[PDB]
Amino acid sequence: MIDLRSDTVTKPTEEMRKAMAQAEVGDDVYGEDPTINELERLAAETFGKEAALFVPSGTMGNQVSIMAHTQRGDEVILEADSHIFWAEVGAMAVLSGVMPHPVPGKNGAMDPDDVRKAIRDGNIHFPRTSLIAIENTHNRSGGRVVPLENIKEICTIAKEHGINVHIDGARIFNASIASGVPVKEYAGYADSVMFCLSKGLCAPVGSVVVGDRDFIERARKARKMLGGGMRQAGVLAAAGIIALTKMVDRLKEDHENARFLALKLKEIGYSVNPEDVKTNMVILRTDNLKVNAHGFIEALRNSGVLAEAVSDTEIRLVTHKDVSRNDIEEALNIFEKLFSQVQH
Amino acid sequence: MIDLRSDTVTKPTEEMRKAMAQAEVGDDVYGEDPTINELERLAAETFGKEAALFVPSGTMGNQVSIMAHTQRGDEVILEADSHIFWAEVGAMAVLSGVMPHPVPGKNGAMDPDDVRKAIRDGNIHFPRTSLIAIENTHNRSGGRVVPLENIKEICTIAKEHGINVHIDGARIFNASIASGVPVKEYAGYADSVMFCLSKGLCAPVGSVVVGDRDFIERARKARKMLGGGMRQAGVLAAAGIIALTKMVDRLKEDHENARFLALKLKEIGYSVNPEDVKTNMVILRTDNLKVNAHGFIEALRNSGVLAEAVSDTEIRLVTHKDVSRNDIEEALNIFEKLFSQVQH
Amino acid sequence: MIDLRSDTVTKPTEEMRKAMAQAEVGDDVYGEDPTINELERLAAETFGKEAALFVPSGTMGNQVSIMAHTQRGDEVILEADSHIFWAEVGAMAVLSGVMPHPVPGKNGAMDPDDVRKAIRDGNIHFPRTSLIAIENTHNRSGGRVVPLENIKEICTIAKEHGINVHIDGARIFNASIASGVPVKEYAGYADSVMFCLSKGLCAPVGSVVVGDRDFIERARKARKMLGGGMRQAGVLAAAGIIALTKMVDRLKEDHENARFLALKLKEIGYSVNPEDVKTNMVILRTDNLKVNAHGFIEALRNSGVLAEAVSDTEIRLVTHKDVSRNDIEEALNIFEKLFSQVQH
Amino acid sequence: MIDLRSDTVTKPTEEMRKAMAQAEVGDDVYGEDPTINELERLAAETFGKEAALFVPSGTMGNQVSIMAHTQRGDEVILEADSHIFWAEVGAMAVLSGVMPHPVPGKNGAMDPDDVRKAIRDGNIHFPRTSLIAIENTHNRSGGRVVPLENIKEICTIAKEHGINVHIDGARIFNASIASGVPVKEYAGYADSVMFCLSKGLCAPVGSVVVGDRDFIERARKARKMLGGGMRQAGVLAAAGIIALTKMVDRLKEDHENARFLALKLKEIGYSVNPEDVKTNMVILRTDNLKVNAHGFIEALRNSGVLAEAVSDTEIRLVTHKDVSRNDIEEALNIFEKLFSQVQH
Numbered sequence A, B, C, D: 001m002i003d004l005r006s007d008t009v010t011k012p013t014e015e016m017r018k019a020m021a022q023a024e025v026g027d028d029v030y031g032e033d034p035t036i037n038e039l040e041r042l043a044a045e046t047f048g049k050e051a052a053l054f055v056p057s058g059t060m061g062n063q064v065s066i067m068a069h070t071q072r073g074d075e076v077i078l079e080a081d082s083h084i085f086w087a088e089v090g091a092m093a094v095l096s097g098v099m100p101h102p103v104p105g106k107n108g109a110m111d112p113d114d115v116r117k118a119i120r121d122g123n124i125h126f127p128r129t130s131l132i133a134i135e136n137t138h139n140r141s142g143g144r145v146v147p148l149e150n151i152k153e154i155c156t157i158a159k160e161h162g163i164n165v166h167i168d169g170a171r172i173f174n175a176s177i178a179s180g181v182p183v184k185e186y187a188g189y190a191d192s193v194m195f196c197l198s199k200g201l202c203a204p205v206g207s208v209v210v211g212d213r214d215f216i217e218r219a220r221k222a223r224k225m226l227g228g229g230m231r232q233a234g235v236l237a238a239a240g241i242i243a244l245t246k247m248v249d250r251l252k253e254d255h256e257n258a259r260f261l262a263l264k265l266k267e268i269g270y271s272v273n274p275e276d277v278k279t280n281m282v283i284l285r286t287d288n289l290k291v292n293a294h295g296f297i298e299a300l301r302n303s304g305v306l307a308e309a310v311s312d313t314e315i316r317l318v319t320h321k322d323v324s325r326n327d328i329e330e331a332l333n334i335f336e337k338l339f340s341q342v343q344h
């Protein structure tokens, strides 16, 4: 099977497996795991922030950030197709008692004027707007890179109102590799950033939240409440340090493989826009096929290629360390064989 | 002052004042207030439902309905400009732990195909869609009437998936008067309807939720939790019986006054669409004026007319029993004088 | 029927009925109801506070106070048998996301040393203690009066830790009449007090929260969220002004009737402690009877007397304006006849 | 340092470190991690249950169980000193919207008659009792073993009412070793059991929830919402399998070391009851010392022994794999040297 479903399926490198076996550990509830502590120090340093917090998932990273930024009855502005709204189980309503205010963007970029219009006036009928969340890269639109200028303008709006800014940077190193913007420059326009270790950077488990000391203290207590306060989690942090410090540069290979995949899919005749492919994701539309996305996914699966439908007419293909150029070429031979069987 | 801010400002009639003074009362927590019990009986009968529940506000009516229809973490589909999302203080997230799924409609009518697309499939990442809310009339769009066929098709969609349907019928009698659809007919396509007594029907306080016996018992316990469990509330229900049984027919006068207001505002030169005015509300746009909506609201207030801005470029004018045709004519004179000094 | 179930069953006086009929009203959402505004002014003045808030029930009064005093995850210290824990539908957990810390008291008075021990230290495992609630009079223990020195010492403890203090003063005027302590004096040791109009003071609907300006504005927004934001509620406030200004002194009659009831029940042979009866409630124990409290309640109801069991072995009898000494004498005759057939 | 603070401080065995490095992993969000899957199969088999769910902490295990057993506004009966109430950050109120009903027990055993009395009647004022939680062993009382007969009688009560039963079995294998009761026999009297891998069984991270298939499916979705849905968590489950299958028998050594510690502390002159010591915990009281528990903890820390104060007059000592008999003897020499310096 060639697995193009997600970059979460990456398996740990040999260096990571060794580091996990040899990890120096302690009880993180007492702040005594030295490898967790070093991962958090490195993460804060990398992002230009005072403090950092390891969490067992990107979902938890986002939700403790929302909890630490908000009070009950607040409203959170976020992009209408972003992960926090789409695919985090409604946690923001249950855990934090906040409402989402979905703003449809273009490729993850909310028009700053629409962000302005979404902020609630001080009026007894309205929730209090206390948080704006930005996702970079933006998953649903195809791993698109949100321009730094968009983040800067939204930060400017937030400072005018006293509103917190959170970046869902699950794939912020993919954004950085594609744009040349260092992650600490994105992070300078936010109060908090969540970034994942367990996607393209190939750690088996985890993400990190970075921000100011007082915010991270609140987020750490939120983590305890949600159940993310682990014991000898240095076993995980050992792999996370390798992910953060050694696995960023090679994300360029995933980007090259996704672009090559898209170029050749277009040549075959599929509805793909290679010009849209800036990081490790390709959106393929079924408009010129007689099957819908779900039927094409099943046909691919039966032919040895795993992918996911993100709508009835769109499939998402995701590259990562565990699909090589050889694997991409094999997948393309499978896509080529299938095209005459599914074309309209 | 000529008050076009809202139809909530209606004061009780002399008949209502007499009825409140001599209301037969009892302790509603024990179900022993005879006037509450008769109002609920009349309301259930009027709407063709098994049971009904008096509440002190339309907000509480919507929120106990949401609580009784949902579990924590569920999603509620509703129109993106509907009152439950716009102007109920984020209560659905705080009180029920549910997420709104805002669907932008056309004049309050969500496209049924967009409703279909908004229902979550059963994946672990997604909330469970358990409720669809429809607002009729639709406030923000200008008191617009949602077509019965829209409500009917959404009811069919909901039945398929085992999803509940709630009508926010704050102004459902205005809708009925304008469409000719009996309120019982609207209500047959919903599990619950909230309708207000304290707006155009001129009661001083309250709304009523109608629905099935088991739903209403759940909503009654939700009412107790939220603090709507009153004692000798028959004082209020006495005016409510008069509102429900005697004040519906004259809503036609409010509609005629709103249509007259809109026609004459257009003749003066203001940006109004009299063809959009089907019940008791008029939207005026400030696009051809030197001031925005907030500037115009202040100019109007200084000149003796009260209205509200619903955006930076739109004001909402609402007619009701306590603005006569005389008052509308006087307001139009004020609008005419103001036009030369606000015109662009 | 002779109704000893509760003092909530009080019906409005003729003076109240006239006042409701001619109440001067306005839209309370705009702060424009003159009778609500005067009731809140009188209430704040009576209790020595900056501001006040009318609410439709004592439950809502307590719950908006909790919301305005707390953040999600906080803990609220309160007496283990107090109404907020016992009989407010778990609202503090649902609406505010706070945990109760029940402290068993003696006659409603929590030992201040137990309050000290219940305050959480700052550890990551513990909620933040942000509120202490005191109930005076204390309902479940038999309408008992919490000593002023208890309230004073708990106030000192709370001030030390920056913890808010709420008095559930549903029956604070009963406490004041029995103790000689002015309600303003009780209230000076609390941040907020909720007191009821709809119990012994005989208004048909409502309670009032008093406190600081900023707290009351937070509580007013909480009221909007919960659905207590009414329109022309001056109809209710007119009766409330009469309740607050004219119905306090005669609570002495309720106390005398309760004490007479208890003395005569003991003379008959029932298990009652007349020395415990300081306001308008009597606890009767069924330990020397063939029936339990529920069996005795049914026997009483069949004989024309309404009361409530508060446990399997205890019934609560409550006096109020609508049970005269004549009615108490008639109830005692019924109790005497029943004794020979229920006695053990 | 001799660390008697907790059994959470256990470090992974050499066999665990090897197994983590060699773990066969996959993406647990897709159910594709074979080592997680095998751990869950083994756990369900061991406890006689249909299904099992790995979680990153015991706190998360308890809280997803509460979420899966309850609806908003429910009440949970639990022992007044149990971990869910004492030390889980008020999560049950925030995450599930439920109230605790603390019942003071004797050594973790709630009197079944008190459990009966705590169940709420069906009444509009009351939350719905839907869950009873039992903790075995009971931490705060000194690692005490709850008798099987207590669990059986509480199960009997729950079946009469349709109430769910959850065992907080963080240390259920310690209970089993001490009592001879197999864990699947305890579990047969519960709907769910949470047990920890990361305490005495020496895994670095994690716990497991066991129960019926439908309950575990709900708990798995709760885990996704809280942020416990990890990716290649087979690295952790590899150690967890060794913990579950190889580390249970040697808990007897921890019990022998705790009993030896207690016997010799009593001989030295400290206020310890060796007869109370049935598993791996010892409570030492400071009643006969001139210092309180906090001062004694600091004196111990400065002398090379780590422990924790659980009140102002009580310290808890906890044995585990990483304190040997040699370490216990060294700690006792330190306790002996200190006694003349702190005795009253």
Ligand SMILES: Cc1ncc(COP(=O)(O)O)c(/C=N/Cc2ccccn2)c1O
Binding pocket: A005, A006, A007, A008, A056, A057, A058, A059, A060, A083, A084, A135, A137, A138, A139, A168, A170, A171, A196, A198, A207, A318, D229
């Ligand atoms: C932008 C963003 N933010 C947060 C998370 C939550 O991170 P998690 O809780 O899964 O560790 C994710 C997870 N995406 C998983 C996925 C699956 C298939 C294809 C692509 N992506 C995310 O894309």
Ligand SMILES: Cc1ncc(COP(=O)(O)O)c(/C=N/Cc2ccccn2)c1O
Binding pocket: B005, B006, B007, B008, B056, B057, B058, B059, B060, B083, B084, B135, B137, B138, B139, B168, B170, B171, B196, B198, B207, B318, C229
């Ligand atoms: C559709 C709808 N649903 C619920 C409510 C809540 O009802 P309340 O809690 O206020 O009783 C309202 C209230 N509209 C008040 C208003 C003010 C100004 C202009 C127009 N309308 C509503 O329009």
Ligand SMILES: Cc1ncc(COP(=O)(O)O)c(/C=N/Cc2ccccn2)c1O
Binding pocket: B229, C005, C006, C007, C008, C056, C057, C058, C059, C060, C083, C084, C135, C137, C138, C139, C168, C170, C171, C196, C198, C207, C318
């Ligand atoms: C101390 C206290 N606080 C708040 C409330 C809530 O107030 P409500 O939401 O009902 O307006 C009550 C209500 N007691 C009603 C009752 C019934 C039978 C016998 C005695 N009392 C209360 O005693």
Ligand SMILES: Cc1ncc(COP(=O)(O)O)c(/C=N/Cc2ccccn2)c1O
Binding pocket: A229, D005, D006, D007, D008, D056, D057, D058, D059, D060, D083, D084, D135, D137, D138, D139, D168, D170, D171, D196, D198, D207, D318
């Ligand atoms: C009975 C019980 N249940 C759940 C948990 C939560 O498990 P956690 O979320 O920490 O993995 C714990 C944790 N006790 C940690 C501790 C520290 C010091 C001394 C003794 N114990 C527990 O004792």
Ligand SMILES: [Ca+2]
Binding pocket: A190, A191
């Ligand atoms: Ca900032």
Ligand SMILES: [Ca+2]
Binding pocket: A007, A008, A009, A010, A011, A198, A199, A202, A203, A204, A205, D231, D232
């Ligand atoms: Ca991975």
Ligand SMILES: [Ca+2]
Binding pocket: B190, B191
């Ligand atoms: Ca239906």
Ligand SMILES: [Ca+2]
Binding pocket: B007, B008, B009, B010, B011, B197, B198, B199, B202, B203, B204, B205, C231, C232
């Ligand atoms: Ca009105």
Ligand SMILES: [Ca+2]
Binding pocket: C190, C191
């Ligand atoms: Ca104060």
Ligand SMILES: [Ca+2]
Binding pocket: B231, B232, C007, C008, C009, C010, C011, C197, C198, C199, C202, C203, C204, C205
């Ligand atoms: Ca009354």
Ligand SMILES: [Ca+2]
Binding pocket: D190, D191
């Ligand atoms: Ca069962």
Ligand SMILES: [Ca+2]
Binding pocket: A231, A232, D007, D008, D009, D010, D011, D198, D199, D202, D203, D204, D205
């Ligand atoms: Ca451990």
